[PDB]
Amino acid sequence: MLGLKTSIIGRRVIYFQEITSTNEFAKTSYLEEGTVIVADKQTMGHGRLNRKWESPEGGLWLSIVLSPKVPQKDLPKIVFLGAVGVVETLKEFSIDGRIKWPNAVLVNYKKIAGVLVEGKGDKIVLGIGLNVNNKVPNGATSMKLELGSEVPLLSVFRSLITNLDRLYLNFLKNPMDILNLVRDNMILGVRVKILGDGSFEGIAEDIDDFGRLIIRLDSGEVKKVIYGDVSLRFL
Amino acid sequence: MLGLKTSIIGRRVIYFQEITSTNEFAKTSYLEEGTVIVADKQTMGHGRLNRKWESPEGGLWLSIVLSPKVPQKDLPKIVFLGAVGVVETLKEFSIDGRIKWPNAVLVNYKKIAGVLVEGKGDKIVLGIGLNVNNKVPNGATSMKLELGSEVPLLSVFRSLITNLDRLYLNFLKNPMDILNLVRDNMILGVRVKILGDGSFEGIAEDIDDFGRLIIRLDSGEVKKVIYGDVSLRFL
Ligand SMILES: Nc1ncnc2c1ncn2[C@@H]1O[C@H](COP(=O)(O)OP(=O)(O)OP(=O)(O)O)[C@@H](O)[C@H]1O
Ligand SMILES: Nc1ncnc2c1ncn2[C@@H]1O[C@H](COP(=O)(O)OP(=O)(O)OP(=O)(O)O)[C@@H](O)[C@H]1O
Numbered sequence: 123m124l125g126l127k128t129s130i131i132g133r134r135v136i137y138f139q140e141i142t143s144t145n146e147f148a149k150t151s152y153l154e155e156g157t158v159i160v161a162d163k164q165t166m167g168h169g170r171l172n173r174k175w176e177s178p179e180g181g182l183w184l185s186i187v188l189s190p191k192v193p194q195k196d197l198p199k200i201v202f203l204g205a206v207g208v209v210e211t212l213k214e215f216s217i218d219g220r221i222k223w224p225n226a227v228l229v230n231y232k233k234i235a236g237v238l239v240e241g242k243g244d245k246i247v248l249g250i251g252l253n254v255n256n257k258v259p260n261g262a263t264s265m266k267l268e269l270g271s272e273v274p275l276l277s278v279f280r281s282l283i284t285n286l287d288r289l290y291l292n293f294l295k296n297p298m299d300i301l302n303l304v305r306d307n308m309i310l311g312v313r314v315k316i317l318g319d320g321s322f323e324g325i326a327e328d329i330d331d332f333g334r335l336i337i338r339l340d341s342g343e344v345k346k347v348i349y350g351d352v353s354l355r356f357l
Numbered sequence: 358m359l360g361l362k363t364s365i366i367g368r369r370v371i372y373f374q375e376i377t378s379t380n381e382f383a384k385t386s387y388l389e390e391g392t393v394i395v396a397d398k399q400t401m402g403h404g405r406l407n408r409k410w411e412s413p414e415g416g417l418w419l420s421i422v423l424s425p426k427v428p429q430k431d432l433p434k435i436v437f438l439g440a441v442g443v444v445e446t447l448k449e450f451s452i453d454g455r456i457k458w459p460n461a462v463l464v465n466y467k468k469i470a471g472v473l474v475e476g477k478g479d480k481i482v483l484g485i486g487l488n489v490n491n492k493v494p495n496g497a498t499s500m501k502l503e504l505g506s507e508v509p510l511l512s513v514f515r516s517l518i519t520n521l522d523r524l525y526l527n528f529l530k531n532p533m534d535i536l537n538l539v540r541d542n543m544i545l546g547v548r549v550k551i552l553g554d555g556s557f558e559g560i561a562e563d564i565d566d567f568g569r570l571i572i573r574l575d576s577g578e579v580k581k582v583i584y585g586d587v588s589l590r591f592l
């Protein structure tokens with residue numbers, strides 16, 4: 123009854139009034155490529171390292187099952203499809219979303235969305251949490267708060283799925299294209315701090331051909347960051 | 358993201374751009390009670406017996422998984438929940454539908470919807486096909502044709518699911534209530550012919566406490582028709 127006209131993403135959609143986590147359901151269940159798992163609310167939503175992700179009613183909490191036929195070296199780029207898709211959807215609603223490398227989107231430096239990719243070999247799950255009309259934790263924002271009025275949640279869903287389908291289809295053809303879109307919509311030229319096994323500060327210059335964040339430290343040393351288990355903090 | 362407020366029917370919804378048959382999928386797949394299977398188009402949609410059910414884009418083709426904890430003798434009334442739900446939804450859109458015992462809804466004697474109940478294991482599958490904006494076979498009709506304008510498909514879905522959830526919840530407690538709703542909304546007092554071996558004609562008088570169609574033959578004999586492979590024609 124939804125009438126989606128996408129090629130892969132959105133071929134099937136499983137909607138839940140409530141779920142533990144769309145990412146967990148997607149990783150666990152036997153699902154075909156392109157199936158979207160979406161829920162009004164999540165009771166156990168999470169980000170990286172099992173950190174809690176607040177998922178009250180009003181927001182867009184979904185996961186997409188992907189089976190990309192691409193070399194191992196290209197899989198780390200899937201998170202960017204989610205980040206860019208969100209930025210494109212936000213621009214459609216006239217919201218200035220900017221990417222915080224490599225899995226978040228901010229509006230005036232406040233987090234409005236997060237992306238979490240999980241994958242075991244053949245199946246890759248692309249999880250996206252976007253604050254639309256829901257209450258958010260301090261330090262975050264939502265589409266409603268930015269526009270000053272409620273936004274039709276289904277319209278946001280339709281917009282995002284359409285954008286993601288296009289981005290994904292092109293990714294399979296030209297896996298490098300997404301990097302340019304990330305560059306054009308990411309926060310750069312400002313000081314950041316990388317928190318991993320130890321830490322360091324510097325200017326976030328750009329992302330390289332592998333999607334690694336290029337940081338120039340005050341000494342001039344250049345470091346290439348692979349997100350993994352590191353956190354980026356703005357100064 | 359659909360924000361359904363129903364109690365049982367609609368707790369989960371599985372949407373397909375395209376499917377063979379929502380009834381077939383619902384029967385062969387493990388699904389919790391209340392799960393709704395819906396598709397934009399069915400390639401192998403079917404009615405009773407071995408007859409095709411045209412399911413092009415624009416219509417509402419869905420199946421609902423139920424596992425009613427009620428006496429065995431009440432189970433045959435599930436088909437009526439579907440028929441009455443359609444009638445209630447049609448009224449909301451200012452269309453007057455009448456039930457053609459035991460599984461169809463007509464508008465000015467033109468078929469606008471059909472109901473098909475099947476069961477695998479101890480789960481019951483309630484299938485409903487309603488013509489909304491889609492083209493229909495000659496002699497049939499649709500919400501669009503009756504209103505002279507496009508009808509928001511999702512609005513029809515929301516309305517129908519809401520009515521069905523209410524009807525089902527009450528059915529679980531008061532399984533006889535549905536019968537009076539059918540009586541007040543079905544075509545009675547007219548001549549009909551029951552096809553097949555031992556065929557016969559008479560006046561469709563009412564439905565009894567089991568949902569059987571009561572027919573008075575010209576001789577005065579009264580026959581009780583159970584709704585199975587029953588083919589009925591208006592004379
Ligand atoms: N609904 C929400 N909207 C915005 N931020 C949220 C929401 N729920 C939780 N958070 C915050 O997001 C964090 C998510 O975990 P995680 O460290 O994996 O995020 P990240 O995207 O990798 O890093 P960052 O929060 O710096 O963008 C939580 O620790 C919490 O501070
Ligand atoms: N989209 C549709 N809208 C209305 N009628 C349809 C549609 N697709 C098929 N039909 C008609 O509905 C019939 C469906 O099969 P089935 O015999 O099981 O229905 P039925 O309700 O028992 O028949 P009837 O109401 O005509 O006595 C087909 O034989 C066909 O004539």
Ligand SMILES: O=C(O)CCCC[C@@H]1SC[C@@H]2NC(=O)N[C@@H]21
Pocket residue numbers: 142143144145146164166167168169170175177182183184185225226235236237238249250251252
């Ligand atoms: O910012 C992050 O660290 C990532 C957050 C990812 C949130 C989404 S909500 C849909 C999906 N289900 C989950 O449990 N997590 C992701």
Ligand SMILES: O=C(O)CCCC[C@@H]1SC[C@@H]2NC(=O)N[C@@H]21
Pocket residue numbers: 377378379380381399401402403404405410412417418419420460461470471472473484485486487
């Ligand atoms: O009038 C009839 O004989 C019954 C038609 C039932 C049609 C619906 S469409 C949704 C579901 N899937 C099917 O293949 N049939 C039912």
